[PDB]
Ligand SMILES: Cc1cc2nc3c(=O)[nH]c(=O)nc-3n(C[C@H](O)[C@H](O)[C@H](O)COP(=O)(O)OP(=O)(O)OC[C@H]3O[C@@H](n4cnc5c(N)ncnc54)[C@H](O)[C@@H]3O)c2cc1C
Ligand SMILES: Cc1cc2c(c(C)c1Cl)N(CC(=O)O)C(=O)CO2
């Protein structure tokens with residue numbers, strides 16, 4: 143059985159390995175050059191959690207990826223003047239996540255696909271698809287075009303997928319775009335600076351500031367990659383529109399992030415040389431065209447990054463697609479069932495990612511008592527009352543079920559605290575009863 147995959151990023155390389163391993167004839171096309179060919183040219187990080195780690199585990203690559211990953215035990219919150227505060231992510235060191243360099247991951251996955259027998263072809267970008275004739279057109283940076291025949295086409299070509307554009311002209315995909323008002327910019331902290339300011343290596347760092355914020359993830363050599371999230375446009379308010387050059391960015395950091403600015407030795411140059419990125423949420427009602435083509439990963443469901451689950455979801459998609467294709471009656475059956483299974487879960491993580499943004503800078507007295515009570519209920523009923531962050535991050539429960547269980551827990555906590563000043567007035571034994579009455583064990 144034959145397949146053509148567009149995009150050798152994270153989902154495309156993983157599905158290529160899983161199908162080649164099963165004896166499929168796989169051809170993978172990528173517009174960038176091969177990153178494994180060392181050049182004289184001169185650092186993006188991601189958070190790997192259980193969903194992505196489990197996908198790599200099935201592919202037999204987890205140990206190689208984790209050997210180059212830095213453990214993050216929790217969230218380190220910075221407010222000027224005050225000492226940083228560590229919020230642990232899990233119950234113990236079994237529940238942690240991992241900072242992995244994006245380029246390192248992609249190189250490991252590329253080697254793994256070739257080892258399984260897939261053929262990879264770089265410097266070729268997909269331009270268009272002719273579905274009636276089963277041919278597609280690719281081009282190099284020098285504009286020269288060539289044509290190829292295909293039997294099955296997998297769009298793994300990212301948030302700006304050309305496969306999706308071609309599909310949307312022969313079927314109605316129910317596309318809807320929800321634009322995000324924030325852009326982002328990447329900046330660097332050196333190993334020297336991070337040591338000098340005693341920045342904890344085994345944590346994710348965040349500088350909240352309401353409508354804008356900064357995060358930082360660690361690297362193996364003790365450097366950190368910093369990401370600024372800030373509105374493109376002002377309604378007045380700060381925004382990328384007012385930051386005309388690196389010197390303006392420096393003044394903004396010294397005023398709004400005064401304890402982070404001294405760590406950013408190359409702020410001015412990074413700001414002017416790295417491009418400002420865009421964010422969005424894009425939802426589709428269907429991900430396939432008959433038995434001829436299918437989408438996965440960011441090509442199917444771009445999401446805002448505030449839960450750190452886009453790569454984790456894409457790798458989970460790749461496992462599912464390979465399973466459906468291996469055992470279905472025919473490609474058309476496989477693609478319809480893949481869409482039916484994954485699209486409701488992709489929709490749910492898209493919604494939870496947006497909610498995490500508000501959840502994190504955007505403080506309440508009710509919220510405090512609710513969280514005090516939820517910890518008690520998780521200690522008394524560890525099998526039933528499980529924080530939604532844990533369900534999303536450390537389990538493989540379908541996203542839609544994680545969201546539903548999270549909703550029941552929030553309603554129980556709301557009614558339990560309503561019109562109570564503090565825990566002294568609440569009948570904990572009675573709350574525990576409702577927990578058992580409404581939440582089945584897992
Ligand atoms: C700022 C930021 C932070 C994030 N942090 C996290 C995090 O902590 N954890 C997490 O899990 N996710 C995170 N994500 C999301 C994650 O990066 C993506 O969801 C993930 O990379 C999607 O993988 P993919 O294989 O579907 O797409 P990609 O990784 O983008 O791969 C697409 C590939 O297709 C190629 N391509 C594109 N167009 C064509 C074409 N026409 N022809 C041929 N090839 C083409 C591209 O060059 C690329 O190689 C973050 C995203 C952003 C923007
Ligand atoms: C880009 C990014 C990646 C993430 C997280 C966040 C905020 C961001 Cl902005 N988080 C969420 C959290 O701490 O609630 C994680 O867990 C780890 O992946």
Ligand SMILES: [Cl-]
Nearest residue numbers: 447450451452
């Ligand atoms: Cl993400």
